Subunit: 393 residues, 4 copies
């Protein structure tokens, strides 16, 4: 096979194909540390040392770039190490801006590599209105997590990309978009003036919950050589095994996301018709979504994704309740898995954060977050129903 | 089993034991991303998210700590990520000192995390004499690679710890020892006034070269909690698979290192009587070793390790010769491999470092560096011989 | 989760659930050979010896049985060893009947286990008409490969089941149906008076062609107990890894096959309207299929499967041509791969069998066989076209 | 590397080397089902189909054969599958002979492929005295389990090979010897007139208790080609992963087996000087062993192995007691593991066999059988002591 501007599905199946003399339709698992060489100076095949590069990683990387309509890609130990290679690629003592509704990741990473006080950070909700007033103070990074977790607030990647060129032209301010929740299938941030697309491969891409891997894609060659250097040097790289496993699960990503999203929409609509036991509902798929205009311009076919957020006509109990009365959806952490899961950001995730903010940024104390899996739609829909009542009673 | 201050070998086999309701003698490979929870608040068992912690990694770490006579252990994606995690725990804008004869590692990591010019670095040969004059200039770390590659100079970990307490008491200067080549079986730096022990697990712990992973061990609960935070936050973590494989590999570590040492020594004694074709020989196990006194106070039973370094009765050729004529020792990089290898630091390794230094630090141009594996001693002894002449001829 | 007569998709996700005290959502890979015991008599948990039974294999077996709407399942090293265990459970020196359009598998296995001349074998095309005439001569087995490779002739599993109770009631003649190409999703032979369903898990269940493993399922307890005995005594079992990897791969079986089918169906009808370059088309999904009456009664939603067989308006070349000119369809062997493949049964497969037969059973010398993967539909449809011409010219 | 009649440890580390253009010092895991082809006729590399052959198996096979001082090797799903292929390779309606003290393996297998009543089987204890009288009755196979499990009775492979040439010249009676318990290291049955060496690689070869794989070796090219035939046709093949994991355990076979043996010997002497609490003790390494003369001619350095067997100065309780009072040894089935194990053949193993026999073959009801691992020797010795008293009190 040899792609030539085929469709997404065709690309998932063959992008990042491999090189085998034997003729293996399937890629082998190369865990080899080192490789023999023709002359001391240079190898008996493009590979010299695993960490520097190995076939499984390299190939998973070529695949994620393509799927992400990007020229380049790099896999790391996790999503956290990926965000972190980015932050440490920043000139010493810099500043970065990011949406509020973010994983504690930024909090963490942003700060750590900001050893003692290194990389400044000014969290900001509503990106398009405070970015100009904030765009400087040493800024060099703009971090957007398109659909926020759990509120699900979509952001206009283009309006941001522009607003930057405007309020900070000449100072190399790169824009990074976290595209984990939608996944390469639903959207491609680079196609909207984004310098780097970052994913937590643990979720959708691998999609089977058995690999903690992260990846980034960029069309900017220099920004990609720097970032790869840090990779080769700080060594927060992925295991040939995890890459290969992830590479394998991404081949059904288009299939798994399509299904996962239809179902989500069919579940949101249901919860958005029950004026009774359902207070608010969050799902970028609903035409009533606050930024549905962006959905239609960044989301393929306007798929809402697999995440749905909603608050019931009750309180913390009903929610903590729903989280258990459930039979098919499994209470836990994480998401984007092959199996349905549901979590209450407030308690589970957003812990060390006073209810003070868990009302402001959106994280309502009585909010139930859910990750739609690929189980039968009706078996799941009917299940959400069967659980509302329980909570109510 | 339940260890109770048993012997190294017993600990290698039962430290880091696992829990399994099915009563498995062998620890299963857990790749799950998440774990179910009884109540939104907390899990149906001690684990919540694989990156935060998972059975395979955690057991590996208890095992490594055990063998290192240490209370705590942490595993990461690689040696380089382990050194990294340590330098980024240092307060912003800090300095460190380290023996000259080091892997490019320090240079790299030390600088990278010293974003632009962050973590200072003053390399120094002969630690015990220039350390007091250097102990400041912003120093917070002293890095020691006990057996220097490839000169094989041994450093007294105690004298350095003491010297530190003297010329810089009151400044939390932590001492880290890279104990990779010797491995936990041959030495335990914590027992000599070292605050952290580092291992690139690929060489001898895993011992089969089929895994890139690194770990550290400490007795200091605070330093361990900080380091663990960065572990969870930057996410430069190992794959439950590479961790489980490495743990599997660790179980024959006492056997594998013991052998590799008896043979290295019996080989060193051979090259140490051939006054003809042998210029010099470097093996910490020879009673004629410069710091043999330190070998005696820090090396179990005085084993020298499996790394011999020697200079033949000729030059660049005779070495580049040997490096090939050999039948049993395989020309490449790396080491600590189960299989016998051989490398010429100068070329293969220390590249972009002008001959100027490659005669300074000790990295002689006509020096042959070998890594004794586990084949038959005599088969190996005899091969080294049949190899001298080739070179000669 | 705990299924309760849910839909296929839900079963595929939750059938064969595992048990683990750490509450992992994903089943761990258990490779362990043995299990600890409380007392000499019996284990500290349901398992005693891996080959006798281990969690990964057991859970897959339940999973497969469920998706196959059956009470029992058994996994072996391969399709072939699955067929053997069966043939070798037949009373010494017996006879069996099977549709001609069969893999060489029957040939081999049936023969081998028929040591020297043990298990008789009377291949017979057109089952329903000569089965009464051959039902005896020592028969004890009738082997149906529902969609014949490659002709794609569908057989009525009921009509045969009945015929048998007729021309041989009172002689335990077991009906075995190979349900590999269609897979549990498209059909369930048990629901049609079949004693055993077989699958070569390599193609569609594991799906990603990275595992050789076979399984069967039956509702018959005795037959299952004998078979399971041979399994434990000959030991032709798969490895816990191969089992887990297959299990992982089945979780998207419904998404994968449903797709491959709609695509296969859309590429048939195209090929089935080009009266010009297309002679005949073979796709159980066309309402013009010889046994489309049987397709409607046995195939779910009337899916045709992902196997299309057709003959262009030319000869050998044009076919061998097509098998190359194609860009998206990868020329090779096997099939039911995640990726589109095409083969010419005659050459590639049906070798050591004279053109004599290769015009009889239907294996036409100018017949193009293709397996539909999960690449984009139009990319593939458009590609078949792009291929027809090349061959033409 | 290129072996040239080097020593066992050298062959262990290099026999079975692989082919990689890249130059991997470490053999990669090839799971690929298939391989591409130069021309429809023959591939683009000596491999065409995984089953017919794949690198990981083949390389394993080469290594085992080499360690077994043999020309040929063949791996299978299990020891059982390996015994199975051998029995089904026999001419329809044959007879075999094997030592009484055997694993239910002959029993099951010998009988199964002996469909209904196919391959005869006359179990005999004391081989050299009843072999002439039984040698016929249709016999074609003579199965010898050198050290019997668990009495630990040694048999003279030469006396029996000879005895066969005398009482049955001309009838191709092949002699197979189960070399599992001693392993390639301690003995090489072919060098003693044996036509086939069988091993359960689950035990000492892989030796980490995470793989069920069996392998045989023979110098007889015709017997090897028939047997490989059945292999390819029945499909009871090992997986690429299990072969790879095993090959990786075999690299320390000589170090592990060397240690397990010294320990078991030092433990047997202890139990053979405790006139008080130890009735009898079975260990082929004690000069007082009934067949010590054979030991000294078949066993390397006269190593007794890792399996001891003994009866305590009490009865059934004292034993069941011992089997639990132990801290370091682990009560379970199996053996040859890296970690110590202990079992009571009577109950655990030999269940469905009336006490009647369990006093005949020697499987005394008050007999404790132990599998010495590689933990420290004194820790284990001191642990056996500490447990005799427990059983006593
Ligand atoms: C889960 C998640 C992460 C964490 O990824 P790791 O690979 O687990 O570090 C980061 N970002 C988002 C948006 C996530 O949902
Ligand atoms: C090989 C080596 C390392 C490198 O470890 P990685 O896991 O590959 O980063 C570190 N230290 C020493 C002393 C080594 O020899
Ligand atoms: C490929 C195939 C087989 C072979 O299966 P193995 O797992 O290689 O033994 C058997 N049956 C069908 C119908 C196949 O398509
Ligand atoms: C354990 C054992 C077997 C069984 O091997 P499998 O690989 O489980 O079939 C056969 N023979 C002996 C002598 C054993 O010790």
């Amino acid at each position: 096979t040899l792609q030539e501007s085929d469709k997404f599905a065709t690309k998932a199946i063959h992008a990042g194909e491999h090189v085998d003399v034997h003729g293996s339709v399937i890629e082998p698992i190369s865990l080899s540390t080192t490789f023999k060489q023709s002359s001391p100076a240079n190898p008996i095949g493009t590979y010299e040392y695993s960490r520097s590069q190995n076939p499984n990683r390299e190939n998973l990387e070529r695949a994620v770039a393509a799927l992400e309509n990007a020229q380049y890609g790099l896999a790391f130990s996790s999503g956290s190490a990926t965000t972190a290679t980015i932050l440490q690629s920043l000139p010493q003592g810099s500043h970065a801006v990011s949406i509020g509704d973010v994983y504690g990741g930024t909090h963490r990473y942003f700060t750590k590599v900001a050893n003692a006080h290194g990389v400044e950070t000014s969290f900001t909700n509503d990106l398009l209105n405070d970015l100009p007033q904030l765009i400087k103070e040493n800024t060099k990074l703009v971090w957007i997590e398109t659909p926020t977790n759990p509120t699900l607030k979509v952001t206009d990647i283009q309006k941001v990309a522009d607003l930057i060129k405007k309020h900070a032209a000449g100072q190399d301010v790169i824009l990074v978009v976290d595209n984990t929740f939608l996944s390469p299938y639903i959207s491609n941030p680079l196609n909207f003036g984004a310098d780097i697309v970052v994913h937590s491969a643990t979720k959708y891409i691998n999609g089977h919950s058995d690999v903690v891997l992260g990846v980034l894609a960029t069309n900017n060659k220099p920004l990609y050589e720097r970032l790869q250097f840090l990779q080769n040097a700080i060594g927060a790289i992925p295991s040939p095994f995890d890459a290969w496993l992830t590479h394998r699960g991404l081949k059904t990503l288009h299939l798994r996301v399509r299904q996962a999203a239809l179902s989500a929409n069919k579940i949101a609509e249901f919860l958005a018709a029950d004026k009774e036991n359902v207070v608010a509902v969050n799902y970028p798929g609903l035409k009533t979504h606050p930024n549905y205009d962006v959905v239609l311009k960044q989301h393929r076919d306007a798929l809402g994704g697999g995440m749905i957020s909603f608050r019931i006509k009750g309180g913390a109990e009903a929610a903590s309740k729903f989280a258990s009365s459930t039979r098919l959806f499994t209470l836990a952490e994480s998401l984007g898995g092959i199996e349905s899961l549901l979590e209450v950001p407030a308690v589970m995730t957003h812990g060390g954060i006073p209810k003070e903010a868990r009302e402001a940024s959106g994280v309502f104390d009585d909010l139930v977050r859910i990750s739609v899996g690929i189980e039968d739609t009706d078996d799941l829909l009917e299940d959400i129903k069967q659980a509302l009542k329980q909570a109510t009673n």
